């Protein structure tokens, strides 16, 4: 039901003269845009990535971003000079900006900034602020950033109005991809455990979309409490991979089965017997 739209920017400044800025955009766990440093323009990564915006509305938005990217780059370089010698290159800056969409016309927007991998700054309300734990020297950059009334008005518009409107259209346009069902396929294997005498069984599950899934090692009807799910790992085709391990005694493998429940199967669970 709820979807988070995330624009993710990563900027690396190596020294006074070298830098790059690259962005990717996500609606839930599907990529909708990429903007490489080598590209003048933002790239769509789905047919529906323009949402419900007209070409004129999209061109205007892109132009605003094109001006931003160049301007942001000079601003960081000038801010470095301003705070010198307190901070120096190399510098890593990340921005996470977007909106989370709730039922009705409800949404919340955000714009969070990290410096050398730590969240230090957000835009909130009508201005930039530091967050708890941020270093004091940032108060000067914040004062300088908050002097720029034109940027404040534009960011307010982007967060309050543009983001939710754009994302509502994206959700409509992309409905069929967002609602896709792809089936897991499972397979079994085994390795030697940390302790001699034991073995570790592995139930591999791959190709499922969307993300929610249930995987348990089982002896008939008894769920094996020792089952350890790993992390969700991406496949290159926008499906997911997950494995569930179980440490057992060599000899006890017979009778064990791996059971997988997923929305795409329509109640026809996968059951793989060792």
């Amino acid at each position, epitope marked *: 039901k709820n979807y988070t739209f995330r624009c993710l920017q990563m900027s690396s400044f190596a020294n006074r003269s070298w830098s790059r800025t690259d962005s990717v955009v996500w609606l839930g766990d599907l990529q909708t845009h990429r903007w490489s440093n080598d590209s003048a323009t933002i790239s769509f990564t789905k047919p529906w990535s323009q949402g419900k915006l007209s070409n004129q509305q999209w061109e205007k938005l892109q132009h605003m971003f094109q*001006v931003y990217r160049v*301007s942001f780059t*000079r*601003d960081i370089q*000038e*801010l470095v*000079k*301003m705070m*010198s010698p307190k901070e120096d290159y190399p510098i890593e800056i990340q921005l996470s900006a977007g909106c989370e969409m709730y039922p009705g016309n409800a949404s919340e927007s955000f714009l969070h900034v990290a410096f050398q991998g730590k969240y230090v700054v957000r835009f909130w309300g009508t201005s930039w602020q530091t967050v708890p734990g941020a270093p004091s020297w940032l108060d000067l950059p914040i*004062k*300088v*950033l908050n*002097a*720029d*009334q*034109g*940027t404040s008005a534009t960011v307010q518009m982007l967060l309050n109005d543009t983001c939710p409107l754009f994302v509502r259209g994206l959700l409509e346009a992309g409905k069929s991809d967002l609602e896709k069902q792809e089936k897991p396929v499972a397979w079994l294997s085994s390795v030697p455990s940390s302790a001699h005498g034991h073995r570790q069984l592995v139930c591999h599950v791959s190709g499922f979309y969307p993300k929610p899934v249930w995987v348990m090692w089982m002896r008939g009807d008894q769920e094996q409490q020792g089952t350890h799910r790993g992390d969700f790992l991406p496949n290159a085709d926008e499906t997911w991979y997950l494995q569930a391990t179980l440490d057992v005694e060599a000899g006890e493998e017979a009778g064990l089965a791996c059971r997988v429940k997923h929305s795409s199967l329509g109640g026809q669970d996968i059951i793989l017997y060792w």
Partner: T-cell receptor
Amino acid sequence: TQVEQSPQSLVVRQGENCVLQCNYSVTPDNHLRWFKQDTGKGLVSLTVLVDQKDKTSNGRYSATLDKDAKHSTLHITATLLDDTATYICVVGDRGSALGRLHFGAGTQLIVIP
Amino acid sequence: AAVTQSPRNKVAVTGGKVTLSCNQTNNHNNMYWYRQDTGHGLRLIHYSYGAGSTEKGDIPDGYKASRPSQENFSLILELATPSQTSVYFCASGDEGYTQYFGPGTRLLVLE
């Protein structure tokens, strides 16, 4: 250059009105200022324009800015001898001290008393 | 918000050392040096974001900048040349975009 003024120079008679132009390619264009500079003196700010389509006035001086066209005009009504000066257009590329100012080379006005 | 410059006028010789000074009591962090020559708009030489900061502008070659305090920003021509005959303007400002200009210094460098 990024900021161009026209005419380069002009001569008018006292009481006549005139119009001075500034055209720029500066990006981004946060604001545009007009200065008056009397011969061998300093820079006196006449007006600053900040909006997408802006109009200002200050006594006998009035100005327009159209950011879409990247064009501004300064109008002097009922010229006086003391208007004899160079008039300079300056475009600031940020709304803060992170900005650079881009200066036009000026228009020389002579008013015959 | 005021800015003063000294000297107001200076005749120097090629190869000599010339120092142009700018003072402001506004507690402005930021100061800027420009030169104005016929046929050009003002052009930025050096600027500074605070005591101890000097940064190169668009035309820094042949000038050194010095910011010993919040109040004072100097432009130093170590080996003056005739091409440095100009009118020099200093400005200051705070975090806002406005630059507050001094009255100008006329320099002539003779052979």
